[PDB]
Design a protein around this ligand. Structure first.
Ligand SMILES: CC(=O)N[C@@H]1[C@@H](O)[C@H](O[C@@H]2O[C@H](CO)[C@@H](O[C@@H]3O[C@H](CO)[C@@H](O)[C@H](O)[C@H]3NC(C)=O)[C@H](O)[C@H]2NC(C)=O)[C@@H](CO)O[C@H]1O
Length: 129
């Protein structure tokens, strides 16, 4: 599924991401835009042999199990394929674990480099929330 911007904002709000650990909704929509272009089916392989999955590009070395990654911890206790669903529940629940694990949203490279410090509430402008 390729989400619309306001459509994704409303889904993330419904699943409890607005201000989760103090990160306003725009931060999450911004991260999704630059990690996956709002596409739940996005995957990208990394040099270390891990793969990133789904709308928030969650990594298989730490968070989900894809059956092919050296030393995976599977901390969200889920197969990585579950993160590609058009239902974002699994991705959101795992993201809440990630953003609580010490480094906040700095775990997402695209957020650090393209969202952090910008006016992120532009990402929810015009949306009926
Ligand atoms: C969205 C996504 O999958 N991002 C990936 C990052 O999670 C990953 O960075 C590493 O994440 C782990 C898991 O949280 C970090 O470990 C934690 O580090 C803090 C201190 O920094 C410590 O207090 C926590 O206890 C510890 N957790 C565990 C379970 O040990 C680790 O620091 C991150 N590593 C770096 C270099 O930032 C990166 C790199 O694998 O990939 C992203 O895709």
């Amino acid at each position: 599924k390729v989400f619309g911007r306001c459509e994704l904002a409303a889904a993330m709000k419904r699943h409890g991401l607005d201000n989760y650990r103090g990160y306003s909704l725009g931060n999450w929509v911004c991260a999704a835009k630059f990690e996956s272009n709002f596409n739940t089916q996005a995957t990208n392989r990394n040099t270390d042999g891990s793969t990133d999955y789904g709308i928030l590009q969650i990594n298989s070395r730490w968070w989900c199990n894809d059956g092919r990654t050296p030393g995976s911890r599977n901390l969200c206790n889920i197969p990585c394929s579950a993160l590609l669903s058009s239902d974002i529940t699994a991705s959101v629940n795992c993201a809440k674990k990630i953003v609580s694990d010490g480094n906040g949203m700095n775990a997402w490279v695209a957020w650090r480099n393209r969202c952090k410090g910008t006016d992120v509430q532009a990402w929810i402008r015009g949306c009926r929330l």
